[PDB]
Scaffold this active site. Structure first.
Site, PDB file in Angstrom:
ATOM      1  N   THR D  13      35.545  85.049  55.570  1.00 56.74           N
ATOM      2  CA  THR D  13      34.853  83.786  55.804  1.00 56.74           C
ATOM      3  C   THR D  13      33.510  83.968  56.510  1.00 56.74           C
ATOM      4  O   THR D  13      33.206  85.051  57.011  1.00 56.74           O
ATOM      5  CB  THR D  13      35.727  82.858  56.681  1.00 56.74           C
ATOM      6  N   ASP D  14      32.702  82.909  56.531  1.00 55.77           N
ATOM      7  CA  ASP D  14      31.426  82.948  57.241  1.00 55.77           C
ATOM      8  C   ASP D  14      31.321  81.710  58.129  1.00 55.77           C
ATOM      9  O   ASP D  14      32.212  80.853  58.111  1.00 55.77           O
ATOM     10  CB  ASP D  14      30.222  83.035  56.282  1.00 55.77           C
ATOM     11  N   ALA D  15      30.240  81.620  58.899  1.00 52.95           N
ATOM     12  CA  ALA D  15      30.030  80.509  59.826  1.00 52.95           C
ATOM     13  C   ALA D  15      30.074  79.122  59.187  1.00 52.95           C
ATOM     14  O   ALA D  15      30.211  78.120  59.892  1.00 52.95           O
ATOM     15  CB  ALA D  15      28.710  80.702  60.575  1.00 52.95           C
ATOM     16  N   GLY D  16      29.962  79.063  57.863  1.00 46.44           N
ATOM     17  CA  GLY D  16      30.012  77.785  57.172  1.00 46.44           C
ATOM     18  C   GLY D  16      31.435  77.255  57.101  1.00 46.44           C
ATOM     19  O   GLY D  16      31.671  76.124  56.672  1.00 46.44           O
TER      20      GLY D  16
END
EC number: 3.1.2.-
Lengths: 129, 130, 129, 128
Positions: D13-16
């Protein structure tokens, strides 16, 4: 306008085959689009707070030659199309001799991060681009 | 509390040296801790419902032998300490031939998914593992 | 002899928690060690020519504060101990405000690129540092 | 059609708050690797045949996101085979079979050491 961004290849970017992992180039392309935005004084961390984010809707990458450990690469980025809520990036990755390693066409859509629903590109961004 | 978690090595995990990238093992250890918690019904969902998230505070890794492309590994995990806001995980990785490849000690703290600041361990967690 | 290496945080380095994934810092530390060696002309190419490679044998990282998307970090690196067949690196990562994010102690061993068995540090490296 | 399950972890996953788009690319590769294993072509068997595969062209279309802890299913099928190359048609769905994204992947068979194009061994051709 052609935006250029240097990228050094580290062990983390390579695989057992002895070359850069194909998914790593995808990340390099993202870094380049991010730096193009920063060049225009735009921060995606700041934008998320305003409920403005960019997501990849479609991406095609064609690979021609490999990059290896320690190569210094150049990611080239150009916005070829701008529409209501999206834009099309044309990018390519070359090495120190300008050998074309791979190229990509990326369809990016502007969205409201909380609902992940498309929204019109901010005018401030369109004005700069 | 011993929990075993299998992990297949793919190209994404390897580097030009022909072995698993040293930082990739760190990710493998994280998956194993996540899966051990899930084994006790502490899925991310359950943790979020309890207003809890875990952050690594300190981690020591010993690299003994390399894992290679397509090796099926087994990550072994145990909770060896639980105090205040801290949890101590002891983990190790072995290959199919049972050879020791890597070992790790991980100190993790409990935080609220918002302020990212430490907080007391939820009553459910201490109760489940004590 | 403190070597400083700047690193920008991109989406690929962050996780759903909104901060940098802890393993990403491990990769950042590796880049800094690679760049410190490069600064002294010990590129990967130069090391292979010396018939040596460096592998991490033991590493500890202590985390204090987080980094986020768009943050420009500085990795600080120094060789705190040079032995006949190993090196101890002391590293730390700070943000633009110079706040300590995390620090690491890394024991690296010199090995032959082929058999991967221990090998003494080349005299060129001993002479340089 | 070969199905491969994949759990989404923080690393993906990423910060989004969603899966990073490059992570799906890695997922597709795992699926291809496992489909080959299923057809008696593990990496060991491939090395024995002196074969390695390289992505020549890839198009991915993203429809909906995957999030932390989702259990996905990667669906893979070989839709074309020609001389030294294979075309993989893949897609990623979630536990309700909602379509998250899909891809078409053109792969080329090469010698592991030199990584130069080479005809697909009959052992694999006769397999598909």
């Amino acid at each position: 306008t052609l935006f250029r961004w240097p990228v050094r290849v580290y062990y983390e970017d390579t695989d057992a085959g002895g070359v850069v992992y194909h998914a790593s180039y995808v990340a390099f392309y993202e870094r380049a689009r991010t730096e193009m935005l920063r060049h225009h004084h735009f921060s995606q961390q700041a934008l998320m707070a305003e409920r403005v984010a960019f997501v990849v809707r479609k991406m095609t990458v064609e690979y021609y030659a490999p990059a290896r450990l320690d190569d210094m690469l150049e990611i080239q980025t150009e916005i070829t199309s701008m529409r209501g809520t999206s834009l099309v990036f044309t990018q390519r990755i070359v090495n120190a001799e300008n050998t074309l390693l791979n190229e990509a066409e990326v369809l990016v859509v502007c969205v409201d991060p909380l609902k992940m629903k498309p929204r019109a590109l901010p005018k401030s961004i369109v004005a700069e681009f």
